[PDB]
Design a protein around this nucleic acid. Structure first.
Lengths: 384, 34, 365, 46, 63, 233, 76, 146, 220
RNA sequence: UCGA
């Protein structure tokens, strides 16, 4: 009874910016843990690996008001520095939505033109009929079929041609889009025009950035809320799972190794600072060639590529060390080592390669502890 | 003179204290510098 | 076990944590087989604290020595010598992993080695003198207990090794389904298990103690630590693994320790795991459990806590421990004996009275 | 809160009074004064 | 002077302020934070905090 | 045995075609157990009549469109799919729709044979361009669920026959979800929110009652084995 | 008109409350001081303007008053 | 886990509704897929596949000539009963070729049906919805610590 | 529509488990219907489990009984595997007394009137010449899983030892569907289910308990 | 001395 509509402030230390503190509405929950909204994690920079958070309870009416208006979570969806949306679908929601919007060639139920005695037959009457066709094994979400839409809004330019008098409040129309792109456009508000694109975290940032400017804040809060439900729902169905089989090794490395190692072995005849640089500059190309050949080898449906290619998480350089070769690793000083890491984490690293790998790995981890200390000292001088 | 409030997307309110906001805007990413 | 083999540079006659530069923290090429480069803290103590290697041992002067297999004229020898730093650089060290023929020798024409740099080099069997006794010479006990260690980055490997010492004894500890062979040796050397020092036959078996009858006629007994509170609050309970009429051997395990199964280190459970995102409930490192683990106690652990109070002579009188607490409802003291302490086996909750005591006051006013 | 009334108006943090007394121990004459007239006393001394 | 005292080189800041017989107008917000006052920003501006609220006579008639 | 308390069912109406239903409380996690079975029952388990094929006069080998009408063959195909008709025949019944000259065709223009009825006379089938004629034969048969276009070679042999994807069950759309309500000291008891959008054939209230009737009778074969003890009402 | 009937603490929306006052800070003292009055009524003295809930925080009552243009304020 | 993977418990589902194999045997822990590739610790997947290999018994056909995958193969390890314990020393371990060949093995789940393919993925059934998941997922036995 | 009243025919594999099949069913109905019974099986089938135990020598669970190899905690972890069936709603207490050397099994308990133990081979404890074990256990009626009910919330005294109570006859339940037929020809979805009990009840009694459970639940 |  007293908890009702009584806001509380959540804090995750360290607090770098003002979004490190946000107001929420409490929901009595069992257990001793705290349930945090997955979208606000980017603001708190809060990992679920065991982070601890603090709660404060405002008392006076002025304090409660400042928590509801100023510090409410739904009120601040944008980073007050760059302006980009800070709370947006990320990680599972990215790959979850990136999976829906994609259109697969020759999927089940794909629409084809009418030929001779066969009518079109690929189109569907209504979106509700597409669900009936989906539940039964006929329709696929990634199919190329086209449907007739009533409530949804068509793109602006295409809207004016279909309708000269106005928009489509209750009026029907048709376009060719994947069902995943139709269901995705159902989450967005009705007034927003159709997208018909495959969702990338960069594109999804362009759309959310467009809603924050054009529409009210509440509509953006509910739209982002509806996006995380679909992002999580289709993240399980995404078919994205890691196994030793999905990760694979490109063959071209051994040739580049044969080429480089042997053509660099011919360089060993001449053998000083440029000699190692000649091997480093040579070995620098071997890593690029393996990664380039690796990108060409991997199919698109494989999960590891779908990740980091949709912007959810990861980078190509990290995948360059996983398969292929991790490449040269720096020594205690800033000097590179000519001898590379020819092995990959998939193939396993030799005893010796591991010893020289910790040289750079620990030095970078010690840098992390130092940079956070100097940045905190710099920030206090800026504030004061 | 300041400009549009980056979080609001609108003009800056009469109460906004932008010195602390700017200090945090510059300091927070400082962990990514080399 | 890992605590006892720890090596830290800080202390009296040593550098302070803030005073220590970044040069010491970086692993030196002389740490091979002596100090484990992977295992160290992730806090302010990185690089200062380390774990002594597996096969290494200390000199009378204090310089760490590492074992090596001497090889002369391209043929591995049964001889083993313990080399230490300066002496290791005067020789070339063959790679532990190398081709070996049946009779024994350098099978390949070109072999790996590490010179006085230390710098890796590809040489021939002519110039090789010393060879590693085996891989993992460098990594410590905690690091050597990680299966597929070569497939993980040093960062996460450091976290995995550190979190292994952060585990907790479970009610029934089961050995790892898949794991390196280090769990066997490391378990019996930790001292928290029971070992038989004489070959013979067990005379009696009980939860309190076990008795062995040696073949030489002597009778030895071993008392089992039962639900003892660890220094950090965990349970040290031991269980006998032997049958009454069984026969043991010198060095054979008898009773398992807090975390052990049949003589191996058991730090956790083997669970059936499906790797997929599940409707947002496992998001960004979060994990979801099957309710079977709660019903079957597989993840259940016991925690003991120690509370202490004293009755001291005060300036105004003497402190008395009794059931006579001045202001209370008689209902709240029902669990206390006449002396005023709590009754063994009784339950409790936050706010209950474990021990009643009293102190004089004056003037009351 | 127990009486259901409104939260009253805050006072002066106690640590600030301690700060003034600490400064007075260093032999630094410190005074909190009103805009009009002269200084005022937080307590017996300020 | 107490804003610089709470920042850095407290010893040097104090001796200089005491020699010059400095006076702090308690203008900035860091001062109001230390003394427990309302910071002169956000809702603490001299205008917002003095707002008066009353129900419109037209709306009060409904009651 | 078993004893339970206070399962309820309420009705909130969004419109004539769709309404909301709630059940509170459900013992965890029965909300998710029977939720998807209700959705599956409402969609594919309710009998209804629809059109399994149509034949427009004058169109045989044409890829698309038609002379005398602004509607392409495809638009009329999905325009005719939205025809809500309930028949008592249980066997295929042939209907006929005819018109000519300038005008616009509606559902009331077709003459329904005795035993079948169209519930949406105001629906728009097509528009006839000036000096044009349109004649179409329809095949209406009962069924359940959603059966796609069928090639039986009887439709394939006939030069004109056009089979259409059949929407049989009158229930168009159904979704669900569960939440947690505290009935007593016991926390997180399940509630079931189920949304159902149907067409004028039957109402959502009658569709729910029919769906529940087929389910209770569907699990009746398992209950007949013993009838030892079950969860109380 | 895209609300989807917001539920709690977000009702009324801030945007419709922002058109009733200068800035978000003016809105705070606006609703806050009114919440002070409503709680004083149950012990300035001028009732609730809108039909209250069963047990409603005085601040939530004041926010619904501002929503319907039922209050006036003058800045200092 | 032992590889540096860590995380709290976001929720515990009842045994009734949980992804389970065709066995009817529910899984235990559900690990987020997105965390595996980024953190650069892939050994957990290896011990997860090998964990399932050692859980169920496995028998190598070997025929007359032996698979070449076993040229440098483990000695007299070809056979092994169900719930067998295996040891993979750090730098003398079970290599990639052996893991793939080890996946092919005996999988008699009360009957003749095998619950894991040579790729280490199985088709899970959602206990909450009642329908199978659209794609094959990686399942196995890992070792986790409290 | 096609008229075929779906009929269910039971099968048997072992005594603990028996298969069941229902035909015919509309396409797509096998998965959700088989799961609606599976979840109800794994949940609401009553028990037939033990609530608390009591031992004369021990006042709590963390002490060892003299002359036995196990401890009270390990003994309780062994007692969790008990499969009991009771016809009485009100609670009742069994009794177990074993002196001298030997191995105490699940059959050594003397059940009261109307209750039985379905796995006498279960291992409890092993004692020696000095070992003596006297323990009484409370068998109760319920369903699903309930944790140990602490005596502080109950009216019990210090001696009684609460234990986690698991009431469920069912062990492992799965299913499968064969739509078969062809793309055309009115393919009928039929499900073949696999139900296994612990011997507390037969697979028919469980599927009837689950079948009759949702029969009363469905309403409109 | 460890956890993020």
């Amino acid at each position: 009874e007293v908890i009702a509509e009584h806001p509380v402030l959540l804090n995750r230390a360290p607090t770098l910016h003002r979004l490190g503190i946000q107001a929420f509405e409490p929901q009595l929950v069992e257990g001793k843990a705290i349930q945090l909204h997955p979208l606000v994690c980017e603001a708190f920079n809060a990992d679920f690996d065991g982070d601890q958070m603090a709660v404060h309870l405002p008392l006076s009416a002025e304090a409660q008001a400042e928590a509801r208006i100023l510090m409410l979570s739904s009120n601040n969806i944008l980073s007050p520095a760059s302006g980009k949306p800070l709370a947006m679908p990320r990680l599972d929601m990215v790959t979850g939505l990136y999976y829906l919007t994609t259109l697969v060639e020759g999927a089940t139920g794909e629409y084809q033109a009418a030929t001779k005695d066969a009518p079109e037959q690929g189109v569907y009457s209504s979106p509700a009929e597409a669900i009936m066709a989906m539940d039964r094994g006929a329709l696929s979400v990634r199919a190329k079929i086209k449907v007739r839409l009533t409530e949804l809004r068509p793109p602006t330019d295409l809207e004016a041609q279909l309708f000269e008098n106005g928009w489509k409040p209750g009026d029907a129309w048709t376009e060719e889009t994947t069902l995943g792109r139709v269901m995705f456009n159902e989450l967005l508000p009705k007034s927003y025009p159709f997208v018909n694109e495959q969702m990338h975290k960069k594109v999804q940032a362009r759309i959310i950035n467009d809603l924050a400017e054009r529409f009210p804040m509440i509509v953006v809060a509910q739209t982002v809320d509806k996006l995380k439900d679909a992002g999580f729902y289709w993240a399980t169905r995404s078919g994205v799972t890691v196994s030793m089989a999905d990760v694979l090794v490109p063959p071209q490395k051994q040739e580049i190794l044969e080429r480089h190692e042997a053509e660099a072995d011919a360089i060993e005849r001449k053998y000083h600072t440029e000699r190692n640089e000649s091997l480093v500059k040579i070995w620098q190309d071997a890593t690029e060639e393996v990664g380039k050949a690796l990108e060409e080898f991997y199919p698109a449906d494989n999960p590891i590529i779908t990740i980091v290619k949709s912007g959810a998480t990861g980078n190509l350089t990290q995948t360059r060390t996983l398969a292929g070769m991790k490449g040269l690793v720096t020594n205690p000083k800033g000097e590179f080592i000519p001898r590379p890491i020819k092995s990959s984490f998939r193939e396993g690293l030799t005893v010796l390669e591991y010893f020289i790998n910790t040289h750079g790995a620990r030095k970078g981890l010690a840098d992390t502890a130092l940079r956070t200390a100097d940045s905190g000292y710099l920030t206090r001088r800026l504030v004061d | 003179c300041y400009g549009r409030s980056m979080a609001t997307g609108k003009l800056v309110d009469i109460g906004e204290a932008v010195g602390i906001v700017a200090a945090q805007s510059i300091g927070e990413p400082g962990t990514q510098l080399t | 076990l890992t605590h006892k083999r720890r090596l830290s540079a800080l202390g009296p006659g040593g550098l302070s944590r803030e005073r220590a530069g970044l040069e010491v923290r970086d692993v030196h090429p002389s740490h091979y087989g002596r100090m484990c480069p992977i295992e160290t803290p992730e806090g302010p103590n990185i690089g200062l604290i380390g774990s002594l290697s597996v096969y290494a041992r200390v000199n009378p002067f204090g310089f760490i020595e590492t074992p090596y297999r001497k090889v002369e004229n391209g043929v591995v020898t049964d001889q083993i010598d313990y080399l230490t730093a300066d002496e290791e650089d005067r020789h070339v060290v063959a790679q532990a992993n190398s081709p070996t023929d049946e009779n024994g020798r350098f099978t390949e024409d070109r072999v790996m080695v590490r010179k006085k740099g230390g710098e890796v080099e590809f040489v021939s069997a002519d110039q090789v003198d010393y060879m590693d006794v085996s891989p993992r010479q460098m990594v410590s006990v905690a690091t050597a207990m990680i299966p597929f260690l070569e497939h993980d980055d040093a960062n996460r490997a450091l976290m995995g090794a550190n979190m292994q010492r952060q585990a907790v004894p479970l009610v029934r500890s089961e050995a790892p389904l898949v794991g390196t062979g280090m769990e066997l040796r490391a378990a019996i050397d930790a001292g928290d298990v029971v070992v038989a020092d004489k070959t013979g036959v067990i005379e009696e078996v009980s939860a309190d103690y076990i008795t062995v009858m040696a073949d030489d006629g002597t009778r030895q007994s071993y008392r089992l630590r039962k639900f003892a509170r660890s220094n950090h609050g965990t349970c040290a309970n031991q269980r006998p693994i032997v049958d009454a009429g069984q026969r043991v051997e010198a060095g054979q395990v008898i009773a398992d320790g807090p975390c052990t199964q049949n003589g191996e280190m058991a730090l956790g459970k083997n669970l059936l795991v499906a790797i997929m995102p599940w409707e947002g409930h496992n998001y960004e490192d979060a994990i979801i459990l099957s309710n079977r683990l709660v019903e079957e106690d597989v993840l259940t652990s016991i925690h003991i806590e120690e509370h202490e109070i004293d009755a001291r002579d005060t300036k105004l009188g003497a402190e008395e421990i009794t059931r006579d607490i001045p202001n209370v409802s008689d209902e709240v003291l029902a669990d206390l004996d006449e002396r005023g302490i709590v009754r063994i086996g009784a339950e409790v909750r936050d706010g209950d009275i474990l021990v009643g005591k009293v102190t004089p006051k004056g003037e009351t006013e | 809160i127990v009486k259901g009334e409104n939260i009253p108006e805050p006072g002066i943090p106690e640590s600030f009074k301690v700060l003034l007394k600490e400064l007075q121990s260093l032999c630094l004459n410190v005074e909190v004064l009103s805009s009009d007239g002269a200084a005022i006393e937080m307590r017996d001394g300020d | 002077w107490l804003s610089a005292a709470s920042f850095q080189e407290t010893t040097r800041v104090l001796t200089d302020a005491a020699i010059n017989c400095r006076s702090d107008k308690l203008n900035g917000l860091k001062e109001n934070v230390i003394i427990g006052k309302l910071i002169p920003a956000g809702t603490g501006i001299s205008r917002y905090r003095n707002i008066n609220v009353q129900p419109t006579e037209e709306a009060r008639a409904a009651a | 045995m078993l004893i339970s308390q206070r399962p309820t069912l309420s009705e909130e109406t969004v419109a004539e075609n769709r309404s909301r239903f709630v059940i509170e409380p459900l013992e965890p996690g029965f909300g998710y157990t029977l939720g998807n079975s209700l959705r599956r029952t409402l969609l594919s388990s309710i009998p209804g009549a629809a059109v399994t094929s149509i034949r427009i006069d004058g169109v045989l080998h044409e890829f698309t469109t038609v002379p005398g009408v602004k509607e392409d063959v495809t638009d009329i195909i999905l325009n005719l799919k939205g025809l809500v008709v309930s028949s008592d025949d249980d066997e295929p019944v042939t209907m006929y729709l005819r018109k000519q000259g300038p005008g616009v065709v509606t559902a009331g223009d077709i003459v329904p044979p005795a035993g079948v009825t169209v519930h949406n006379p105001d629906m728009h089938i097509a528009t006839l361009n000036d000096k044009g004629k349109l004649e179409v034969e329809l095949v209406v048969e009962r069924g359940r669920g959603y059966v796609p276009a069928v090639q039986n070679k009887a439709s394939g042999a006939e030069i004109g026959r056009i089979p259409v994807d059949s929407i049989y069950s009158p229930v168009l759309k159904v979704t669900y979800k569960v939440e947690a309500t505290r009935v007593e000291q016991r926390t997180d008891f399940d509630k079931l929110i189920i949304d159902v959008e149907t067409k004028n054939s039957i109402s959502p209230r009658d569709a729910l009652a029919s769906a529940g009737g087929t389910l209770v009778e569907l699990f009746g074969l398992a209950r007949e084995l013993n009838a030892d003890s079950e969860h109380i009402e | 008109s895209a609300y989807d009937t917001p539920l709690g603490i977000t009702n009324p929306p801030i945007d419709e409350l922002l058109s009733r006052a200068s800035s978000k800070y003016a809105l705070v003292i606006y609703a806050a001081k009114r919440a002070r009055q409503i709680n004083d009524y149950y012990n300035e003295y001028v009732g609730p303007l809108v039909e209250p809930g069963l047990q409603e925080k005085p601040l939530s009552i004041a926010l619904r008053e501002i929503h319907g243009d039922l209050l006036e304020h003058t800045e200092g | 886990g032992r590889h540096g993977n860590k995380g709290v418990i976001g929720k515990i589902l009842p045994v009734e509704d949980m992804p389970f194999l065709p066995d009817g045997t529910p899984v235990d822990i559900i690990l987020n897929t997105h965390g595996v590739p980024r953190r650069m610790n892939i050994g957990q997947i290896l011990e997860t596949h090998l964990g399932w290999v050692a859980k169920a018994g496995w028998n190598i056909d070997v025929a007359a000539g032996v698979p070449d995958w076993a040229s440098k193969l483990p000695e007299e390890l070809y056979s092994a009963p169900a719930d067998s314990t295996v040891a993979t020393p750090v730098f003398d371990g079970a290599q990639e070729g052996e893991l793939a060949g080890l996946l092919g093995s005996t999988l008699p789940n009360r009957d003749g049906e095998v619950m894991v393919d040579a790729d280490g993925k199985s088709t899970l059934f959602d206990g909450r919805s009642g329908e199978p998941f659209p794609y094959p997922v990686t399942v196995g036995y890992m070792y986790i610590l409290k």
